Structure formats: C-alpha cells, structure tokens
From a paper:
Addressing the elusive specificity of cysteine cathepsins, which in contrast to caspases and trypsin-like proteases lack strict specificity determining P1 pocket, calls for innovative approaches. As a working model, [name] was chosen because of the resolution of diffracting crystals (up to 1.3 Å) and crystal packing with accessible active site cleft. Reactive site mutants [name] and C25S of [name] were used in structural studies.
The pattern II group (binding shifted to the non-primed side) consisted of structures of nine protected peptides and one non-protected peptide that all bound uncleaved into the non-primed sites. Electron density maps of the peptides enabled the unambiguous interpretation of residues from P3–P1. The nitrogen of the amide protection group at the peptide C-terminus was bound approximately 3 Å away from the ND of catalytic H164. At P4 and beyond, the features of the electron density maps became weaker and less precise; however, it was possible to model the peptides KPKKKTK, RLSAKP, GNYKEAKK, and EVCKKKK up to P8 in the averaged kick Fo-Fc omit maps. MPD molecules were bound to the primed sites of all structures.
Author numbering:
A (entry chain PA): 447 to 450
B (entry chain AA): 1 to 221
C (entry chain BA): 226 to 446
Write the structure that this text describes.
Amino acid sequence: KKVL
Amino acid sequence: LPKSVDWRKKGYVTPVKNQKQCGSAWAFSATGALEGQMFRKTGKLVSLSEQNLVDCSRPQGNQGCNGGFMARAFQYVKENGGLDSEESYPYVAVDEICKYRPENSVAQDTGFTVVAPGKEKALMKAVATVGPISVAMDAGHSSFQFYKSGIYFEPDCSSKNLDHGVLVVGYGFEGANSQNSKYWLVKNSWGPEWGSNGYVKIAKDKNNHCGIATAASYPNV
Amino acid sequence: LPKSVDWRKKGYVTPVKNQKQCGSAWAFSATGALEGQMFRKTGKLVSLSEQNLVDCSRPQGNQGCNGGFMARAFQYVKENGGLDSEESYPYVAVDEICKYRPENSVAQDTGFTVVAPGKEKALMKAVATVGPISVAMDAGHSSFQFYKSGIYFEPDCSSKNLDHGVLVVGYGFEGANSQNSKYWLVKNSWGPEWGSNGYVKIAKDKNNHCGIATAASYPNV
Ligand SMILES: [Cl-]
Ligand SMILES: [Cl-]
Ligand SMILES: [N]
Ligand SMILES: [N]
C-alpha cells in the first residue's frame, strides 16, 4: 500500500 | 515530438473526480489512463469505476483506501477480464465488498507498458504518442495542497519517495519559446475545486521534479 | 428547473483558453458553445479553432482581433460547411490569412438560436436544457479585470453596452438557500490565471447584471  | 500536447482537448479525459478521505489516488490514476486508451480504441469516452478497483484488487497487491499502485490495477483488469463503469459501480470512498459484474464491464487491458524510470523524455514520447499516462509523484507538501496556479516547483520534492498517483494529460510551455518554462499537465483526483480546475502544471525537464517520470505506465488495450 | 447546473461535470467544456492580445473573445465564446453542442451530439469533446474564426469570418461581418459577434461566427460555420479543430488550426492571437481546410473540419452548424433578450429566466431555461450558452457582457470595469472569487457584482455595470463575449456553463447559488445569492457560472478566455481559475460567478436574477442575458445564443447542430 504505498501510493495514497 | 509536438511542442505541446493536451489530450483534454481531443476528448480523452473525463471531468475531474474526487477520492475524498480514501487513499485511492492510484485507482483514479489507473481509471484515468484506461479511460484514455479505451477512447483511443473505440471513440467512446466512458467513466470507469475506481470503486471496482478499490474493492476487488487486493489479490493483485492493492490495499483499497489504504494505498495501491497503478500497475497492480492494470494487472487486475487483465486478470479479471474487465472493469465496470463509474455509473454501474459507484464510488463511495470506503473499502467495500467486491461487486464486480462482467455484464457491466466497459473496459479491458492485456497488461501495461512501463516508461523507462526517471526518463522525462521517454515520458514525453509516451504522452505524445499514446495518450494520458499514469504517474506517481511526491505530493506530500502544503505547497501542493494549496496550489492554485502557475508552474509548480517545490524544493523539498523527492524524485524517489512518491506518495500519490496522478495522470499526465499533456505538456506545454509558457511563453514563445517552447524550450523553456516547460510543464507537465497533470490531472489530480481532489475535485475540480482543488488547484487549477482540478489540474496542476508541474515543472518539466527540471530533473524529474517530484518524481513524475519515476514510475509511469499505461494500459495496453 | 434544477437549482444548479454545471456542464463542466458532464463533459461539455474544454479547458480554459487565452485570447491574449487580440479582441477575439467572440470567437472563444462561439467555440465554447459549439464545443458543447458537438459534444452533446457525438459524445466527443474536441477543441475548436478560434483562429479559423478570426481569419475566415470577415465576409460574415466579423473583424478578427478587432472584435466580432458569436452569431456571425455560427453563421460562418453554417455558410462554410465546417470549422477546423484547434489542433489542426492553432491559435496565435493575431489576424492572419484564412487557412481553412474541409478535411480538418470537426464541426458544423445549421444556424443558431437566440435566447429571449433580457430574460434571465429564459437564459436559465436554455442553460438547463441545451448546454453552455454564448453570451455578451459588460466587462469594462477594473473590478472585472481584478476579480478573484465570490459573486461578481459591479454597481456601474451596463446591461446594454456590452464589450465582451463569454460562456455560461451553468448557474447556482451560494449558501444553503437555493434562491439566495444566485449566480451564473461563466467561462472566460483570459487564461486559467485570471479570476477563479479562469471562471467567474456573476450575480444572477439581479436585473440582468452586466447584460448577461441581453444577447445570448447557441449554435444548432
Ligand atoms: Cl504503478
Ligand atoms: Cl452575437
Ligand atoms: N495518494
Ligand atoms: N472582448
């Protein structure tokens, strides 16, 4: 889950 | 390559959307790019479901409102055999049960193409020849949050540690010289009210400012 | 009718453009209305050439950078059999020789419809049922040049002597009462840096403020  | 490009002016881009309080920018960046490629293929602009991606792509490595990546979304659309429309699978900005319906699919992809990392000219070529491109960037700054107009340039930006997915819909330049004051035309997913009607001009050919060319990709339709 | 309308959210409106130092607002207002009517007819939003209107519609009574009229622009399109895309016939903000080519045409019209003059309720009905509407206004005040946000109201505004063509893309109201603080949603052609990212809210139902409903029209496609 890196890009928010 | 053209001195400037703006796919919004050719019918490839849907109106600006809003992810609200959910970490789904990766899903809006992916639907943006697939909207453009589906338009290039069929001539029809159809808004695509970010919610379908948020609820259904955990197997591919996404985490819904807790984060994700555009390449994993395109991988999901390939493995799944389709993606539903925005209309039929509406956005609610919370993790919900996957309700993918094949009868409502309006898009497909066979995988995706990656732009060479860090290469702004490779990205320029992709934007000019393909259509809108999904990209990641460092948006972790109050200067971005309250951006209103002009070419955005942030000294504290990183080209390596990125935290937001957006869509490059074109590039351009200010003034009469096409070789200076260059910018990337970027569509955000914070609503039309944010920025410049939902868009931001990011400094172009200034050492990969904010990482725009670090992790760019587009779906193969 | 709806208490609010915003055609930008439905795919009818191209990005904000900039006429620069050429008195061609009439051509931007005309392409904006033709863009919305061609989108309604085909589902494809394609930017149209103001330069084609500036260089080619002198026979219809327009005067290029020296001014003109949206209705003469729609007459030129009907008489000429077509109008080129902005991509094929780029804007340079000066009067030049006509370069129209039918092969590059992406729009047509059979004439135009005039809204009842002076009737803001007639204009509200046309905006709600047709799409963006071409209108003329009194922009000859410094308060308009320096407008930034909020509902524009200029005490010295004329409803009869108009000097600028713009595009009404919707209407709405501020506050929680739909009859309170009403406004027209207007796209200008002075670039995204002017006003509210290129748009302005003009006071609505305040006696045809600034002449917004005096000379409104749209192309028939
Ligand atoms: Cl990615
Ligand atoms: Cl007119
Ligand atoms: N993000
Ligand atoms: N104008």
